Amino acid sequence: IAKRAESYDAEYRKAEREQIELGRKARAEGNYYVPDETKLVFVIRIRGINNIPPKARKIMQLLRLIQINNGVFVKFNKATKEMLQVVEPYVTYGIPNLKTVRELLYKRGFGKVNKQRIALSDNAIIEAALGKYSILSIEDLIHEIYTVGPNFKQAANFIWPFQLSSPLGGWRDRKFKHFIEGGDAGKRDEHINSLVRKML
Amino acid sequence: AHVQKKNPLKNKAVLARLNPYAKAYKANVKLNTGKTPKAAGEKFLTVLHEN
Amino acid sequence: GIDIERHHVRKSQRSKPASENVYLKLLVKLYRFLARRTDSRFNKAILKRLFQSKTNRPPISISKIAALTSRKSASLEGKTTVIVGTVTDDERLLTVPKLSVAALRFTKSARARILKAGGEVLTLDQLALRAPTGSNTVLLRGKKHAREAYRHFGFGPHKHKAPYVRSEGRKFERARGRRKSRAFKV
RNA sequence: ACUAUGGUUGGAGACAACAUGGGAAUCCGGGGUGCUGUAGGCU
RNA sequence: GAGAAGCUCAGACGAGUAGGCAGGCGUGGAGGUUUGUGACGAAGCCUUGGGCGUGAGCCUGGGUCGAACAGCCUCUAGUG
RNA sequence: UCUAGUGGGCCAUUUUUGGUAAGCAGAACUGGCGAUGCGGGAUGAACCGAACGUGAGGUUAAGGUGCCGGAAUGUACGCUCA
RNA sequence: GUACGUGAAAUUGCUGAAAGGGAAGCAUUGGAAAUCAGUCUUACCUGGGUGAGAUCAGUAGUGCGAGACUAUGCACUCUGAACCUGUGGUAGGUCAGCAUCAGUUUUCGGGGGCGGAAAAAGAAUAAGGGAAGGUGGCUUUCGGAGUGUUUAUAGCCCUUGUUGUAAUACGUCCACUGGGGACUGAGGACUGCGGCUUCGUGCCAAGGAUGCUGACAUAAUGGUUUUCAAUGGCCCGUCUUGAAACACGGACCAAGGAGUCUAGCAUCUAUGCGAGUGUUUGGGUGAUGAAAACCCAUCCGCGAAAUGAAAGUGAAUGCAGGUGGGAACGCCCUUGUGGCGUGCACCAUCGACCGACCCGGAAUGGAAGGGUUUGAGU
Ligand SMILES: [Mg+2]
Ligand SMILES: [Mg+2]
Ligand SMILES: [Mg+2]
Ligand SMILES: [Mg+2]
Ligand SMILES: [Mg+2]
Ligand SMILES: [Mg+2]
Ligand SMILES: [Mg+2]
Ligand SMILES: [Mg+2]
Ligand SMILES: [Mg+2]
Ligand SMILES: [Mg+2]
Ligand SMILES: [Mg+2]
Ligand SMILES: [Mg+2]
Ligand SMILES: [Mg+2]
Ligand SMILES: [Mg+2]
Ligand SMILES: [Mg+2]
Ligand SMILES: [Mg+2]
Ligand SMILES: [Mg+2]
Ligand SMILES: [Mg+2]
């Protein structure tokens, strides 16, 4: 498990360096390096349970976003993207970095064990549930979520939807306009990480 | 078993129970030990300052 | 607030018999233990049926037992038949074969005819000793929907169920709405 | 153009702008002016 | 052992009219049981004292009083 | 499977029809009140926020922070005299 | 004390307590005053002082092997058994304070890695360009106003070199690190996962608080009552879309006061018996004591056959059939949500059989042959 963790660290660091080197090369030549689109998105429900129309209410149920300030990891594809478009006023989402993923799992990570919410306080709980997918530890689980590994569906579903607090420091003045309009709803790109720091 | 959740980010002993790699984890590696070239380019800077 | 919709929340099954029979309580005690300390679906089947009401535990006769255990491709030759319920007699079966049956109750006529044909009658606790996991046993049930009420359930236009009538004959619901010569048929 | 969704947006209102999405018609211009199956005939 | 009608570990959840179901509280009378309470004070009542229960209610000190009355398992109803 | 209550609704957003208009009448969609307390809109069934077991601590929504009143008689640039 | 057992409430007088600026009542929280409970450190264990005493462990003997018990003696005293004392120990409430931890959290720092135009600037320095002049100078006139030339005795702007791996800001990350504050301490022998170890039933911050002190103990903390202050609280019941309503009922208190019993029916449950079931129309022990219990015959009801208006007729081709799913069981795999074989219940489905009906169909009978049909059937 330690050896797997070390190789994951080297993998994250290697991918990050290559992104910097490719950007530097493009700037030098005067061309443009278009980075890879995100495969992972973190979604936080910002609206309570009142006054929700039927389609959005169903979509948030399918997203396991049943309570305000709940959070989930979602694999980003065309099917997921169109679902998030319908619930843009009711959620906010963006690209989480490595610190967000590992801290969500270390501090607020709970596993669905026999349909019960169990704290991830020992690597045995992870191995019992996801050992068939070669996931033996919390770092194995973090790596699977962050890199969207081939067993992302089983790993992400095993994680209970995160029960975040209200953000320390509050929200923006008006929560329920789009992030582009200076509100809090909808896609906010890497700013999802600053929001999670206040909520985790 | 498990009467009280302990945050591994605060309780170092719990962080050792999970993640055996934490002991050997080396943060803050220096990679700028070389001459540190500049990568801006002539075309990039003339595009940057237009208008 | 949480947005939880709850449909299958409370389990709909019996967790114990409604009966106050002390000996049924002793049988439940035996099969609570057996269903818990073995991996046998047979023992969990017996425990569940020990809870059931009378209408959910229909009787079975020795004719049906003899027929079910004597099929052409049976191999149910020398195996114990088990029913959580009453075993009745079928006087139409003039000659009873040799049968081994475990049951809650045996009718006096059923018990006498089983024994006279060289067979054997067991209670469910005797069965637990002989086959503690129900191995090489034929678990059987009587016909649940043979009771009168199922002639009537679902009565409605063109459902071909039996009406509730105080008497049978002409003048008792065989007129307008039951034939073409009287407005319409059903 | 229109439109799903959004705001304790603007405006007395009529409406309008903006935000996350979907997206015409018409006219005009260029190009084109039958293709093909079955069976059989034909300097 | 832990009234197996018991014991033990864990997780999620909690608006409610009309309405539905369950488990309880209290009252008159009946069977059973409790070497049950009682003129050395039953029942009832008052209380500027105490205790128990989420609650229906229950127990108790002091005062008043004078002939009966209660707990437990069941039965029952002109039962709040 | 058996059975109860119900078979007077009403408010808002948005699409509407009738009407001079209406705190008007009638329909469409969703959310609500009825059966919903709580923070806010001085007040208020329906508007905003949020839906509730008994409590401790923390943080928020909508909305606020001269005094009544918990919270800057805060910061920056203008406009305005009634 | 006959205005007589008990002697409630409404309502009233006296006494006491308390409060009171156009209602009162209630809720939350504390103050004040009044009032209530701790009876602690009892039990059990050991030690210390003296005291007296039928004296205790192994044994001898009285159901064969092992174990418990009583009983006759011995063991005759550093042992064992009862009793006396000490303001004996662990002291026991109430409340504080600090420390070391754990859980949650808030607030303030320090160090470092990386990123970007490998920031933009900037400083000092070497090579350039330029126009506004400090106007250096020129000049109305020895007392200052206007010119008209690109560094003078000033300065500025725009380009490139290094000393560059410049700094700094910002962004991001550190399983880097240092403090301050608050709330909580659920659980109760052990067991786990980790770490550290002198490798051991050792140590730790690692499956939830301990340690160290002190003061009080007609105090304190809790409880109760009244009242005050601050904040909130409209009058209940009802019909209603909607009641605080200028909608109706309600001055007050006691006692009474409304889903019952019966003939049925339906579902569900329990009990007995089961192809049957039902002793209470009756009759008997029966007279003693008998509205009960208990016993006993023939009928009869419902069920064991349907269908048809009726006259009538009346249920197996077959393992009482075939197909699909399927409980339970058995066998094979090989670790899968397996494959294989029987197949209860139930549902869907293709047939067969009985009655009705519609057919042809070789005086009375309707046998074989049929049918898209029909029945509360088999
Ligand atoms: Mg704050
Ligand atoms: Mg706000
Ligand atoms: Mg719009
Ligand atoms: Mg809105
Ligand atoms: Mg409720
Ligand atoms: Mg009475
Ligand atoms: Mg008395
Ligand atoms: Mg009083
Ligand atoms: Mg209590
Ligand atoms: Mg009554
Ligand atoms: Mg203030
Ligand atoms: Mg008020
Ligand atoms: Mg109503
Ligand atoms: Mg009212
Ligand atoms: Mg009225
Ligand atoms: Mg009226
Ligand atoms: Mg009146
Ligand atoms: Mg009364």
- Token pair for C121: 């009658």
User: For residues C17 and B49, what is the distance between their CA atoms, to the nearest angstrom?
Assistant: 87
State the residue for tokens 């081994």: C100
Q: Which residues contact A4 (CB under 8 A, 6 or more apart)?
A: A136, A137, A139, A140, A143
Resolution (A): 1.9
Taking one residue from A and the other from B, the number of pairs with CB-CB distance under 8 angstroms is: 59
Q: Which of C38, C92, C33 is nearest to C62 (CA)?
A: C92
Rounded CA separation C172/C167 (Å): 7
Cα A137 to Cα A112, A125, A131, A140: the distances in Å are 15, 8, 9, 5
Closest CA to C116 of C186, C59, C62, C175: C62
A140 touches chain B (CB under 8 A): no
Cβ-count burial B22-34 (b if 16+ within 10 Å, e if not):
eeeeeeeeeeeee
**Exposure class string for C135-163: b at 16+ Cβ within 10 A, else e:** eebbbbebeeeeeeeeeeeeeeeeeeeee
In the reported structure, the alpha carbon of residue A183 is separated from the centroid of ligand 4 by a whole-number distance in angstroms of 13
Please tell me whether any atom of strand F lies within 7 Å of the Cβ of C152: yes
Residues less than 5 Å from ion ligand 2, measured at CB: A 173
Tokens of A196: 């999670």
Q: Do the Cβ atoms of C109 and C130 come closer than 8 Å?
A: no
Residue of B nearest to A2 (CA): B21
How far apart CA B10 and CA B8 sit, in angstroms, is: 5
Q: Hey, CA dihedral for A70, A71, A75, A77, is it positive or negative? A: positive
d(CA C81, CA B11): 62
Residues in chain A: 200
Nearby residues of B8 by Cβ (< 8 Å), 6 or more positions away: A106, A107, B14, B15, B17, B18, B19
β-strands C100-106, A186-189: how paired? unpaired
A121 contacts: CB under 8 Å, gap ≥ 6: B2, B5, B6, B14, B18
Q: Supply the DSSP symbol for A176.
A: T
B–C touching, 3+ CB–CB pairs within 8 Å? no
**Beta-carbon count within 10 A of A173 CB:** 9
Are chains A and C touching, using the cut-off of 8 Å on CB pairs and a minimum of 3 such pairs? yes
Tokens of C158: 């063109």
Task: Retrieve residue C77's tokens.
Answer: 């030759």
For strands C80-88 and C60-61, give the pairing: parallel
Q: Is the CB of C166 under 7 A from strand G?
A: yes
Residue B30 and residue B39: Cα distance in Å, rounded?
19
**Dihedrals φ, ψ of A193, to 5°?**
-75, -45
Residue ranges of the alpha helices (H) in C81-122? 108-116
Q: Is the CB of C90 under 7 A from strand G?
A: yes
Do the Cβ atoms of C107 and C88 come closer than 8 Å?
yes
β partners of residue A91: A45
Instruction: Dig out the tokens for C99 from the structure.
Output: 């049968």
> A92-108 in b/e burial notation, b at 16+ Cβ within 10 A?
bbbbbebebbbbbbbeb
Token pair listed for A121: 């306080």
Helices (H), chain C: 22-37, 41-51, 62-68, 108-116, 124-130, 149-152
Which residues of chain C make contact with A61, given a CB cutoff of 8 A? 3
CA distances from B15 to A9, A47, A135, C96, C130 (A): 16, 34, 18, 74, 55
Nearest to A73 by CA among A162, A143, A134: A162
CA distance C173 to C116: 49
How many Å apart are CA A7 and CA A19, to the nearest integer? 18
**Bases of chain G within 7 A of a CB of the protein:** 102-107, 111-119, 165-166, 172-176, 186-187, 192-196, 204-208, 265-276, 307, 309-310, 319-320, 327-330, 341-347, 375-377
Contact C134, C81 (CB under 8 A): no
Chosen from A45, A58, A65, A66 to mutate, greatest number of chain C CBs within 10 A: A66
Chain C residues in contact with A50 by the CB 8 A cut-off are 1
Determined by cryo-EM
- Taking the C-alpha atoms of residue A148 and residue A188, their distance in angstroms, rounded to an integer, is 20
Q: What is the DSSP letter of C135?
A: T
Cβ C85 vs Cβ C57: under 8 Å: yes
A123 touches chain B (CB under 8 A): yes
Q: Which residues contact A42 (CB under 8 A, 6 or more apart)?
A: A71, A72, A73, A74, A93, A94, A95, A96, A100, A104, A192, A196
Query: How far away is chain C from the Cα of A128, in angstroms, using its nearest Cα?
Result: 21
Q: Which two tokens stand for residue A159?
A: 């994680």
CB interface of A with B, residues 9-28, below 8 Å: 9, 17, 24-25, 27-28
Q: Are A184 and A175 in contact (CB under 8 A)?
A: yes
Distance CA A180, CA A186 (A): 8
The count of C-alpha atoms lying within 13 angstroms of the C-alpha of C148, restricted to the half-sphere facing its C-beta, is 2
Comparing C-alpha atoms, which of A3, A6, A8, A1 is closest to residue A146? A8
Which residues lie closer than 8 Å to A200 by C-beta, 6 or more apart?
A: A100, A103, A104, A107, A108, A164, A165
Measured from the Cβ of residue A155, the count of other Cβ atoms closer than 10 Å reads: 23
Nucleotide nearest to A112 (CA to C1'): E11
From ligand 9's centre to the CA of A26, what distance in Å?
75
- Provide the greatest CA pair distance for chain B: 68
Enter the tokens of residue C65: 């037992």
User: Residues A92, A44: contact at Cβ < 8 Å?
Assistant: yes
Q: Which nt has its C1' nearest the CA of A114?
A: E11
Residue A41 backbone dihedrals phi, psi, to 5 degrees? -140, 140
Q: Which residues of A touch B1 (CB under 8 A)?
A: none
CA distance A101 to A42: 9
Q: Of B5, B21, B47, which has the smallest distance from its Cβ to A121's Cβ? A: B5
Residue ranges with strand state E in A123-178: 162-163
Give the separation between CA C35 and CA C48, rounded to whole angstroms: 10
- Strand D close to A52 by CB, under 7 A: no
